[PDB]
Write a structure and sequence with these properties.
456 residues, Glycosyltransferase, Rossmann fold, binds uridine-5'-diphosphate, six-stranded parallel sheet, mannogen synthesis, sugar binding protein, seven-stranded parallel sheet, binds calcium ion, alpha/beta
C-alpha cells in the first residue's frame, strides 16, 4: 500500500518568529512522521501571516494571509464579515487545488488521502474539492478529519445560543453543506479522547459512530523531550498557585503559610526532591490517593515537593485543595492548575518521579509524555498502563481501595527517590517512549487504521 497524502492544517507551524498552537505543532510532527515512513509521501499546507512558503523544498506550502489566523474561540470566526469568510476559504481552496495538481502531476498518480484538521471549513474545502474531482471523472479521494476540539466548542456555543457566538455555521455545515450527515463527504474522523469522541457524536449523529475513532496513541516528541539546561525555577518557579475562587487562605495553619492563591512557590531549589501529578481532576485519577500518600511523607522531614497539575471544576478543585491543606496538613504540596504542554515538558524534565494512580486509565498519555523527557512513572495495575509500564521505566502499584493505593504509592515514591529511579531509569524511559510511541509509530498505526476502516 502506497500513500500520497495531502494534509490541510488549521494553524501555523513552529518557525522563525512564530510559535505553534497545539494543533499546529502536531500537524508538523505528523508531516515529518508520515514522510519518514516507507511508501509514504505527505504534503501539508497551512496558513501564516508571518511565514512564507519555502523556496528550497516542495513538501509543504504556506497559505499567506494578511491578518492573524481566525480562531474558533486573535481574529474570531464570527467577527469577520460574511464576505471576508467566503474569500478566506475560496482563496485557500484555490491554493489547495493548485498544490494538489502540482502533486498529482509530480507523481503521475492521484492523491489517495486527504487530511483536514479541525471540524470546520478545512473539511468543507476538501469536501468541495472532492465533489469537483468527480465532476471530471476522477475518483473522489477519501477524507479523514481530526477533531481536536476547538471547532466543536464553537458549534456548542452557537447551539447554546451563547453571547459572542450567534448561530451562523453549525446549521450550515449540517443542513446546507451536509459534511457529517453521511459517509458521502467525510470517510472517517479521529478524536483524541472519548470526551471528544462523544462531543462530536452528539453534534453530528447521522455520522456513523463506527467511523469516529480514537487516534492511535502517541506523544509528540517535538514537544515532549529532555529539555536542555532546565532548572527548577526556569520550569515552574514562576508558576502561580491555583486552588479555587473563594479560597480562604486564612484557615491555613502557620506551617502552611506557603500556600496562597495566585502566588508562586517560594524557594523551589530548597526542596530535596520533586514529585509530579498531571491530569484532569476526575475522581478516577485518584488525586486523593496522592495527597493521602504525600501526607505520610511530608512528616518524614525529607523535603519532598509535590506538584498537582491539571484542571478541575470549581467544585472538584475546592474538594482536593481543602482535602489537601485543611484535612491532611500538606505544606509541601502546591496546586498549579493546568499548564501548556511545553511548560509541562520543562516540569517533567526536572522532576524526580511522576505518579498517575489512575483506576482504569484508558491509555494515559501523561505516562509516556513524562517518559519521553527522561523521568520514571508510577501508576496502578489497571488500564492502558498495564501494557507498557514495566520495572525498567517505573512501577505499577497493586490495585485497591483508594487508601490502599495511597499507602502503596507512598511505598513507591519512597523507593523511587531512595533508589534514584530518575538516574537509573530516566535514560531508558526516554529511549523507550521515543521508540514505541513517537509520532512515527502513531503515524504508522493511523494510516493502517485508515486503510481498513475508512476506504469504504
Ligand atoms: O495541565 C495539563 C494536564 C494535561 N494535559 C494534557 O492532557 C492530555 C490528556 O491527559 P489526562 O491525564 O488529562 O487525561 P486522559 O485523556 O490521558 O485520561 C495529555 O495530552 C496531557 O499532556 C495538558 O496539556 N495540561
Ligand atoms: Ca474540531
Amino acid at each position: 500500500k502506497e500513500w500520497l497524502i495531502f494534509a490541510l492544517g488549521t494553524n501555523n507551524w513552529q518557525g522563525p518568529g512564530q510559535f505553534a498552537p497545539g494543533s499546529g505543532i502536531l500537524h508538523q510532527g505528523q508531516h515529518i512522521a508520515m514522510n519518514s515512513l516507507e511508501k509514504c509521501h505527505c504534503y501539508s499546507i497551512w496558513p501564516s501571516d508571518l511565514q512564507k512558503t519555502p523556496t528550497d523544498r516542495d513538501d509543504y506550502r504556506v497559505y499567506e494571509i494578511p491578518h492573524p489566523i481566525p480562531i474558533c474561540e486573535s481574529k474570531r470566526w464570527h467577527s469577520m464579515t460574511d464576505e471576508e469568510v467566503t474569500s478566506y476559504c475560496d482563496n485557500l481552496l484555490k491554493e489547495c487545488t493548485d498544490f494538489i495538481e502540482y502533486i498529482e502531476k509530480k507523481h503521475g498518480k492521484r492523491i489517495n488521502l486527504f487530511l483536514a484538521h479541525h471540524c470546520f471549513m478545512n473539511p468543507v474545502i476538501m469536501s468541495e474539492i472532492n465533489e469537483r474531482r468527480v465532476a471530471q471523472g476522477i475518483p473522489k479521494v477519501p477524507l479523514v478529519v481530526f477533531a481536536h476540539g476547538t471547532a466543536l466548542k464553537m458549534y456548542e456555543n452557537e447551539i447554546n445560543k451563547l453571547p459572542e457566538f450567534p448561530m451562523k455555521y453549525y446549521d450550515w455545515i449540517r443542513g446546507t453543506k451536509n459534511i457529517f450527515e453521511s459517509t458521502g463527504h467525510v470517510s472517517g474522523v479521529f478524536a483524541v479522547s472519548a470526551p471528544q469522541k462523544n462531543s462530536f457524536e452528539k453534534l453530528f449523529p447521522l455520522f456513523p459512530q463506527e467511523r469516529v475513532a480514537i487516534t492511535p496513541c502517541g506523544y509528540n516528541q517535538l514537544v515532549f523531550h529532555r529539555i536542555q539546561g532546565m532548572t527548577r525555577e526556569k520550569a515552574f518557579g514562576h508558576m502561580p498557585q491555583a486552588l479555587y475562587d473563594g479560597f480562604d487562605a486564612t484557615q491555613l495553619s502557620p506551617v502552611q503559610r506557603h500556600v496562597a492563591s495566585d502566588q508562586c512557590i517560594p524557594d523551589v531549589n530548597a526542596y530535596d526532591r520533586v514529585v509530579v501529578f498531571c491530569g484532569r481532576f476526575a475522581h478516577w485519577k485518584r488525586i486523593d490517593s496522592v495527597l493521602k500518600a504525600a501526607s505520610r511523607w511530608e512528616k518524614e522531614d525529607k523535603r519532598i515537593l509535590t506538584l498537582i497539575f491539571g484542571a478541575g471544576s470549581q467544585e472538584t478543585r475546592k474538594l482536593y485543595v481543602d482535602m489537601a491543606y485543611q484535612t491532611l496538613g500538606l505544606k509541601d504540596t502546591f496546586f498549579l492548575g493546568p499548564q501548556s504542554q511545553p511548560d509541562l515538558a520543562n516540569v517533567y524534565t526536572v522532576a524526580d518521579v511522576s505518579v498517575f494512580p489512575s483506576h482504569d486509565e484508558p491509555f494515559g498519555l501523561v505516562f509516556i509524555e513524562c517518559m519521553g523527557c527522561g523521568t520514571p512513572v508510577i501508576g496502578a495495575k489497571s488500564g492502558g498502563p498495564l501494557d507498557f509500564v514495566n520495572d525498567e521505566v517505573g512501577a505499577l502499584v497493586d490495585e485497591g481501595t483508594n487508601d490502599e493505593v495511597a499507602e502503596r504509592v507512598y511505598a513507591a515514591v519512597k523507593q523511587a527517590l531512595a533508589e534514584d529511579w530518575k538516574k537509573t531509569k530516566g535514560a531508558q524511559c526516554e529511549q523507550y517512549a521515543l521508540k514505541k510511541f513517537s509520532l512515527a509509530s502513531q503515524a504508522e498505526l493511523m494510516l493502517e487504521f485508515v486503510e481498513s476502516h475508512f476506504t469504504k
